[PDB]
Scaffold this active site. Structure first.
Site, mmCIF file in Angstrom:
data_model
loop_
_atom_site.group_PDB
_atom_site.id
_atom_site.type_symbol
_atom_site.label_atom_id
_atom_site.label_comp_id
_atom_site.label_asym_id
_atom_site.label_seq_id
_atom_site.Cartn_x
_atom_site.Cartn_y
_atom_site.Cartn_z
ATOM 1 N N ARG C 13 0.836 -1.175 0.000
ATOM 2 C CA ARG C 13 0.000 0.000 0.000
ATOM 3 C C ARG C 13 0.886 1.244 0.000
ATOM 4 O O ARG C 13 0.353 2.337 0.293
ATOM 5 C CB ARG C 13 -0.993 0.103 1.211
ATOM 6 C CG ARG C 13 -2.134 -0.893 1.097
ATOM 7 C CD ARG C 13 -3.223 -0.764 2.108
ATOM 8 N NE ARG C 13 -4.115 0.387 1.900
ATOM 9 C CZ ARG C 13 -3.929 1.622 2.387
ATOM 10 N NH1 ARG C 13 -2.880 1.974 3.162
ATOM 11 N NH2 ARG C 13 -4.903 2.532 2.141
ATOM 12 N N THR C 168 -18.900 4.282 16.691
ATOM 13 C CA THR C 168 -20.043 4.830 17.431
ATOM 14 C C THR C 168 -21.173 3.800 17.328
ATOM 15 O O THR C 168 -21.436 3.353 16.206
ATOM 16 C CB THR C 168 -20.516 6.186 16.818
ATOM 17 O OG1 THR C 168 -19.312 7.052 16.771
ATOM 18 C CG2 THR C 168 -21.596 6.801 17.704
ATOM 19 N N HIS C 189 -8.424 7.187 5.130
ATOM 20 C CA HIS C 189 -8.145 6.363 3.965
ATOM 21 C C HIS C 189 -6.627 6.117 3.761
ATOM 22 O O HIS C 189 -6.267 5.139 3.011
ATOM 23 C CB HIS C 189 -8.737 6.979 2.663
ATOM 24 C CG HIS C 189 -9.182 5.950 1.656
ATOM 25 N ND1 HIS C 189 -8.580 4.739 1.414
ATOM 26 C CD2 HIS C 189 -10.258 6.038 0.805
ATOM 27 C CE1 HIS C 189 -9.213 4.086 0.455
ATOM 28 N NE2 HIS C 189 -10.217 4.860 0.063
ATOM 29 N N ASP C 193 -8.640 0.810 3.724
ATOM 30 C CA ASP C 193 -9.437 0.773 2.507
ATOM 31 C C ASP C 193 -10.790 0.173 3.009
ATOM 32 O O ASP C 193 -10.882 -0.214 4.175
ATOM 33 C CB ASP C 193 -8.784 -0.057 1.420
ATOM 34 C CG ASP C 193 -7.432 0.464 0.940
ATOM 35 O OD1 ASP C 193 -6.606 -0.408 0.559
ATOM 36 O OD2 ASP C 193 -7.231 1.730 0.942
HETATM 37 O O1 LIG Z 1 -9.854 7.499 -4.664
HETATM 38 C C1 LIG Z 1 -10.449 7.201 -5.675
HETATM 39 N N1 LIG Z 1 -11.610 6.676 -5.613
HETATM 40 C C2 LIG Z 1 -12.493 6.403 -4.484
HETATM 41 C C3 LIG Z 1 -12.700 4.919 -4.513
HETATM 42 O O2 LIG Z 1 -13.416 4.473 -3.342
HETATM 43 C C4 LIG Z 1 -13.768 7.201 -4.643
HETATM 44 O O3 LIG Z 1 -14.483 6.641 -5.771
HETATM 45 C C5 LIG Z 1 -13.399 8.695 -4.674
HETATM 46 C C6 LIG Z 1 -13.208 9.446 -5.819
HETATM 47 C C7 LIG Z 1 -12.864 10.824 -5.703
HETATM 48 C C8 LIG Z 1 -12.855 11.275 -4.372
HETATM 49 N N2 LIG Z 1 -12.649 12.711 -4.365
HETATM 50 O O4 LIG Z 1 -12.368 13.210 -5.372
HETATM 51 O O5 LIG Z 1 -12.712 13.257 -3.276
HETATM 52 C C9 LIG Z 1 -12.938 10.613 -3.211
HETATM 53 C C10 LIG Z 1 -13.246 9.301 -3.393
HETATM 54 C C11 LIG Z 1 -9.819 7.320 -7.195
HETATM 55 CL CL1 LIG Z 1 -9.102 8.850 -7.221
HETATM 56 CL CL2 LIG Z 1 -8.417 6.175 -7.026
#
Ligand SMILES: O=C(N[C@H](CO)[C@H](O)c1ccc([N+](=O)[O-])cc1)C(Cl)Cl
Ligand SMILES: O=C(N[C@H](CO)[C@H](O)c1ccc([N+](=O)[O-])cc1)C(Cl)Cl
Ligand SMILES: O=C(N[C@H](CO)[C@H](O)c1ccc([N+](=O)[O-])cc1)C(Cl)Cl
Ligand SMILES: [Co+2]
Ligand SMILES: [Co+2]
Ligand SMILES: [Co+2]
Ligand SMILES: [Co+2]
Ligand SMILES: [Co+2]
Ligand SMILES: [Co+2]
Lengths: 213, 213, 213
Positions: C13, C168, C189, C193
């Site tokens: 990761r 919670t 995150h 995951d």
């Molecule tokens: O992080 C990503 N995707 C997650 C997958 O769970 C989600 O779809 C997501 C996309 C964009 C995001 N954002 O732009 O804040 C956050 C989560 C892609 Cl950028 Cl790799």
């Protein structure tokens, strides 16, 4: 004035208030389902409509607890004597919404008159705020009648010192013998703990289960 | 080009767009359950698999509404003619995920070929983005097949001007006579109101209830 | 020391960790329902109480997965050998809460003794942190026993590098033949995951379905 300055120095929550206001600023949202089976029957036996009644009942419950009517005014913590609902209205024609407010009244009939009168006057106005500035002593209510949800959350880039509760309702649904309405409440942790939110929700459920008048 | 510059000056939402983009920047998420009872039978009568079909159907519904395909390009608001799905793939071997995209097609069979071909080529690649940069005209889809949830929300430290919808699905479950799939949608309020989200969800439910081809 | 420096250079990761820590900083929350039908019977056949047992079981599950015990110490990523629960206690008298922690032990009986002893000593202390600083190796647990919810999310103005999970629980409810407990998990995150969260929840469900001792 229509507010009182709150005594922060002797408040049992004074440490929590500074902690959640400035050390670790945060708010939370929760969505729970209210049982509106009894309210539906009361509505069926009356000429009132669902949306205005829910506005009334939510405002009535907020108006009973001080921690839901706090604000910072002139750098001090105050409690509004009373707050008026600011709610969303959808325009079918443009598929856009407007936010309106009308004075709260503990008399359901007078509340209905205030509502219909604001509705009468701005039903065709597509500005986001047809009345101009939002009254400082407000609560926000919105509805998404087109879809049922189990959760709702607003992600706000800045909520510093904004203490008015945010309440969102979804389309209700039949869950066996009951009619349930999803309701999301979002508050600032400086003025509200989980207990205070639960107490508001429990009180709203009781109001839904009681006579309208 | 594959986009058109949107006419902001004559848009019925122009005040809302500036308000939620810069005055009170915010987005929201909601989780609702889609009934996939009919889709499960259509799948049972075919050789298609669940994940790719859901990707297809979500992309198809997004591709029908302009407000879900907005972006800022060169400081202007545009609408993509079409967007391709960017979805997550789990690697059992490392227990990590990758994000891939493949071209959308209104022909389900051609879509399946694009998908299997991207899958074929990068099934073993553990980079977060095996293809390199994400196409600008994308939508994000992810799945958590290991657990059912009633709510999901992303807490993002900065989402300025990012208008592509974020959709997350959980493990489906049997809820009496029905098979329900939890689906979370997260959008930026500058381009989408609650109505637009509800309309997307209602349209996805209809697509799930219709023939695949 | 009670931690080990984690090998970031060879972690599968490592790209995800830098991406979610600094490129697109974000966390997520999910709420799922755990079936506590079997646990209720085990509790019924014992003298243990619900809250302390849930604390124990949540701590036990966290203590099994490294990704739930990560932290930044001296600018490096570490894994705590073990974490102790920090949980909320409600004071009926002031209607305020306090957060306490007690040492985790894999022996349920010794855990119960640690808990009752901390409870004994600070049941009347209304400071937010009666013990003084929170131990660095902690997990946060809180409960809202007064209301059932389907979703819960914390909106935090700054969560940079804070990797301890936030859990919670709401009031449980009878859902036909089962007793379900809503549980919300919120993580960063960079270290977790969706798979890791699902794995924690699945493991907690198994622990709830197993003998206490
Ligand atoms: O992080 C990503 N995707 C997650 C997958 O769970 C989600 O779809 C997501 C996309 C964009 C995001 N954002 O732009 O804040 C956050 C989560 C892609 Cl950028 Cl790799
Ligand atoms: O945006 C508004 N209301 C929405 C309606 O869905 C909601 O009630 C709300 C209120 C305040 C808010 N905030 O202050 O962050 C966010 C959403 C009024 Cl300001 Cl127009
Ligand atoms: O606020 C706290 N706990 C709440 C209790 O509901 C929750 O567990 C929590 C922990 C950390 C947090 N964070 O770090 O953003 C937010 C909430 C402890 Cl710091 Cl007192
Ligand atoms: Co301060
Ligand atoms: Co009063
Ligand atoms: Co501007
Ligand atoms: Co088209
Ligand atoms: Co970096
Ligand atoms: Co160990």
């Amino acid at each position: 004035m229509n507010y009182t300055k709150f005594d922060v120095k002797n408040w049992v929550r004074r440490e929590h208030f500074e902690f959640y206001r400035h050390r670790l600023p945060c708010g939370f949202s929760l969505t729970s389902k209210i049982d509106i089976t009894t309210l539906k029957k009361s509505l069926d036996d009356s000429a009132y409509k669902f949306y205005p009644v829910m506005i009334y009942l939510i405002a009535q419950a907020v108006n009973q607890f001080d921690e839901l009517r706090m604000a910072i005014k002139d750098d001090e913590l105050i409690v509004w004597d009373s707050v008026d609902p600011q709610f969303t209205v959808f325009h079918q024609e443009t598929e856009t919404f407007s936010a309106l407010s009308c004075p709260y009244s503990s008399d359901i009939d007078q509340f209905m008159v205030n509502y219909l009168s604001v509705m009468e006057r701005y039903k065709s106005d597509t500005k986001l705020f047809p009345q101009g500035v939002t009254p400082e002593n407000h609560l926000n209510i919105s509805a998404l009648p087109w879809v049922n949800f189990d959760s709702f959350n607003f992600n706000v880039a800045n909520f510093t010192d904004y203490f008015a509760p945010i309440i969102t309702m979804a389309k209700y649904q039949q869950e066996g013998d009951r009619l349930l309405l999803p309701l999301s409440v979002q508050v600032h942790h400086a003025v509200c703990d989980g207990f205070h939110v639960a107490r508001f929700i429990n009180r709203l459920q009781e109001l839904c289960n009681s006579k309208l008048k």
